[PDB]
Amino acid sequence: TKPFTLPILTISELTNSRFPIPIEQLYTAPNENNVVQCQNGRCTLDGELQGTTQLLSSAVCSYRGRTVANSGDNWDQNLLQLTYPSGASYDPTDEVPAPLGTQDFRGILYGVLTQDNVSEGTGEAKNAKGVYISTTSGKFTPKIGSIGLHSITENVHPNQQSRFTPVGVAQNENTPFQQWVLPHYAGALALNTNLAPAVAPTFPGEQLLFFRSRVPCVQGLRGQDAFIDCLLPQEWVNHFYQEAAPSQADVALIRYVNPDTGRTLFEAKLHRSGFITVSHTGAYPLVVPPNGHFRFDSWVNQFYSLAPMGT
Amino acid sequence: KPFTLPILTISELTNSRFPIPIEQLYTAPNENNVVQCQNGRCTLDGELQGTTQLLSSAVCSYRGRTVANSGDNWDQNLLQLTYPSGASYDPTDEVPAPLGTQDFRGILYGVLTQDNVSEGTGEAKNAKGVYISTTSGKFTPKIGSIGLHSITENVHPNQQSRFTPVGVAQNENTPFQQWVLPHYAGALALNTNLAPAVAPTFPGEQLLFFRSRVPCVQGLRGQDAFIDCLLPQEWVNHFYQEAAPSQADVALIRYVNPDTGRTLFEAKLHRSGFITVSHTGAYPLVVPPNGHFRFDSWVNQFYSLAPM
Ligand SMILES: CC(=O)N[C@@H]1[C@@H](O[C@@H]2O[C@H](CO)[C@H](O)[C@H](O)[C@H]2O)[C@H](O[C@@H]2O[C@@H](C)[C@@H](O)[C@@H](O)[C@@H]2O)[C@@H](CO)O[C@H]1O
Numbered sequence: 001t002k003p004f005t006l007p008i009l010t011i012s013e014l015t016n017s018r019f020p021i022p023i024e025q026l027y028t029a030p031n032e033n034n035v036v037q038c039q040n041g042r043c044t045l046d047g048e049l050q051g052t053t054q055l056l057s058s059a060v061c062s063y064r065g066r067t068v069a070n071s072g073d074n075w076d077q078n079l080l081q082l083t084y085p086s087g088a089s090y091d092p093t094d095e096v097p098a099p100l101g102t103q104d105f106r107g108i109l110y111g112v113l114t115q116d117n118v119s120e121g122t123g124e125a126k127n128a129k130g131v132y133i134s135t136t137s138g139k140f141t142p143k144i145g146s147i148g149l150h151s152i153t154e155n156v157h158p159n160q161q162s163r164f165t166p167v168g169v170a171q172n173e174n175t176p177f178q179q180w181v182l183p184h185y186a187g188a189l190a191l192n193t194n195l196a197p198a199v200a201p202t203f204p205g206e207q208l209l210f211f212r213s214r215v216p217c218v219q220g221l222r223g224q225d226a227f228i229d230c231l232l233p234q235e236w237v238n239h240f241y242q243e244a245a246p247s248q249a250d251v252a253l254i255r256y257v258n259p260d261t262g263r264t265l266f267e268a269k270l271h272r273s274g275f276i277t278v279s280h281t282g283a284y285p286l287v288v289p290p291n292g293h294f295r296f297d298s299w300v301n302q303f304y305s306l307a308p309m310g311t
Numbered sequence: 312k313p314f315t316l317p318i319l320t321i322s323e324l325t326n327s328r329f330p331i332p333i334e335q336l337y338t339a340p341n342e343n344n345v346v347q348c349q350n351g352r353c354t355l356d357g358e359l360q361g362t363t364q365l366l367s368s369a370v371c372s373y374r375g376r377t378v379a380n381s382g383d384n385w386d387q388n389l390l391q392l393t394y395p396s397g398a399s400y401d402p403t404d405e406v407p408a409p410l411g412t413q414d415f416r417g418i419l420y421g422v423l424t425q426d427n428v429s430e431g432t433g434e435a436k437n438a439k440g441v442y443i444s445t446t447s448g449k450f451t452p453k454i455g456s457i458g459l460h461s462i463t464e465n466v467h468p469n470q471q472s473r474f475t476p477v478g479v480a481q482n483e484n485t486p487f488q489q490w491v492l493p494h495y496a497g498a499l500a501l502n503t504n505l506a507p508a509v510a511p512t513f514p515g516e517q518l519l520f521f522r523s524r525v526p527c528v529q530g531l532r533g534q535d536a537f538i539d540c541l542l543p544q545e546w547v548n549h550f551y552q553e554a555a556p557s558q559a560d561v562a563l564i565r566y567v568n569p570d571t572g573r574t575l576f577e578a579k580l581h582r583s584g585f586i587t588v589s590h591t592g593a594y595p596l597v598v599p600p601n602g603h604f605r606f607d608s609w610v611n612q613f614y615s616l617a618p619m
């Protein structure tokens with residue numbers, strides 16, 4: 001059978017699968033009261049995409065569609081009638097939680113809407129509209145094919161083909177950014193459907209290992225970081241999709257190796273459903289050498305005891 | 312090690328010159344264009360060139376620390392650059408500019424984010440719309456600095472800052488020119504470390520491009536801001552991973568429809584990392600949604616393609 005492999009990519013050559021920015025570090029922590037059930041960056045080791053996961057970083061937290069006016073509303077002054085980010089038509093009966101790439105965190109997404117081009121004489125960046133897309137709005141119903149746009153800078157024109165380019169998140173006085181609380185993809189109208197399952201270490205002494213990025217925060221979190229943590233980088237998702245190598249067990253043993261020295265820094269379990277655990281207790285940011293990378297070692301027995309990750 | 316292409320349809324490819332999807336394949340004669348883009352440059356055996364790196368999220372993005380440029384009515388601040396990864400940048404590095412630097416003349420538009428501000432400061436107050444114009448005397452990424460023109464919100468000096476690209480802009484005196492390279496060290500100095508210009512040399516051939524429409528936040532009313540790349544980012548990354556030795560100057564590739572099993576057309580993928588087709592005229596290709604290129608065989612530079 002086709003052997004399973006990982007791409008050979010260092011920490012600085014990986015992209016967050018939940019927001020279009022580079023991975024900055026590996027980070028482990030206990031779940032505590034978080035339900036870890038993100039919908040972007042979900043893929044099995046044999047290449048089955050799940051949740052709202054698709055292949056392009058440029059589609060993650062991006063939206064496309066046609067605007068419609070939303071009169072009588074001080075927050076969502078317009079709505080965006082959605083397609084898939086590819087431009088392909090979207091049907092709410094599609095077996096997805098929401099259009100692929102839809103944000104998978106509760107709170108406010110900030111970015112720029114672009115629409116019909118305007119003349120040079122109209123002025124600077126007049127076809128760039130700063131907007132908030134809040135999941136706590138009753139208009140956040142991407143499953144049903146529509147989201148609310150709250151304008152901050154420049155007027156959004158109704159009735160134009162429009163693209164939303166994400167820039168970061170925001171926290172206002174009553175809308176905390178909660179990366180592990182899923183949106184209600186159908187708002188008040190229906191329960192979420194078609195979800196990739198929640199994940200947890202169930203193994204003694206183990207914790208999830210995350211690929212961590214700091215997302216820009218355009219309002220709030222002064223002196224704090226808006227972290228977004230993914231289970232797989234986009235490049236791993238895409239690799240597994242390409243390869244479709246059959247999984248020979250529940251767990252692939254993987255090792256973080258330094259090719260300069262030839263040494264293994266630590267080992268981890270890569271689970272068939274597409275997530276990583278390490279042997280460690282406590283919240284801990286890993287320090288890895290710049291040229292280091294994970295490599296597939298072997299398929300292991302499900303009760304395999306990892307060498308402690310350590311400091 | 313055998314050479315291969317990734318199996319990816321037209322809607323599963325990313326422009327290597329701006330972080331947006333490829334929309335179509337397009338061929339045209341060079342005419343007076345010098346085709347020498349610096350992003351999306353990679354040999355078939357996996358050698359990155361120009362300002363090319365692996366992450367779409369780094370293309371036309373900048374990172375660094377801001378410094379005040381008081382009294383300049385265009386660039387009110389500068390950005391002292393690192394590599395987009397955050398790694399320190401030195402002008403003596405053997406690159407045309409920091410990896411991912413824009414490789415077109417004109418105005419790049421996007422949003423600068425800096426130190427987080429309190430919730431009570433107001434909506435999107437840590438988001439600064441800015442123009443980065445290559446025709447500014449402050450556009451000198453090779454020497455580690457670029458000019459930021461704030462559209463309205465105030466950019467703070469002395470803060471760690473990220474620029475996220477959104478699109479291009481055209482104002483009254485700054486046309487968007489995708490095949491004119493910036494002066495990476497400003498207008499007094501010559502560009503260095505450039506990936507070479509490419510052109511068709513066999514009779515009846517033209518370059519084939521992976522074409523996208525970039526958002527344009529000012530100008531080009533009723534027109535499209537095209538950005539055309541020689542290789543999608545996914546092909547660059549694939550060749551980098553594989554590092555398969557090239558067995559000849561040209562890889563024959565065929566665009567196939569897996570639903571019907573038929574070949575729609577064939578093309579030459581050159582070892583230096585660009586494609587030619589047999590056609591004369593500006594022409595947007597129509598390809599089936601599920602179609603993709605596949606590697607056929609190694610041939611030489613003289614192979615005569617079936618007309619597209
Ligand atoms: C800026 C602000 O604080 N606005 C308050 C409302 O909260 C925003 O409402 C919108 C939707 O309109 C969106 O959820 C934002 O994220 C909020 O910040 C607030 O609206 C009320 O609370 C919301 C959560 C939502 O349930 C909405 O339907 C409801 O009317 C109102 C009322 O408390 O006050 C506004 O100042």
Ligand SMILES: CC(=O)N[C@@H]1[C@@H](O[C@@H]2O[C@H](CO)[C@H](O)[C@H](O)[C@H]2O)[C@H](O[C@@H]2O[C@@H](C)[C@@H](O)[C@@H](O)[C@@H]2O)[C@@H](CO)O[C@H]1O
Nearest residue numbers: 383384385386417418444445446447448449482483484485
């Ligand atoms: C908005 C506008 O049209 N401004 C004119 C200036 O052009 C801009 O200059 C800045 C740099 O300061 C930048 O290049 C922009 O892209 C331009 O649009 C214009 O400046 C002159 O022309 C430039 C091309 C540049 O060479 C600059 O150094 C030069 O002074 C001035 C003066 O002609 O008029 C403005 O209206």
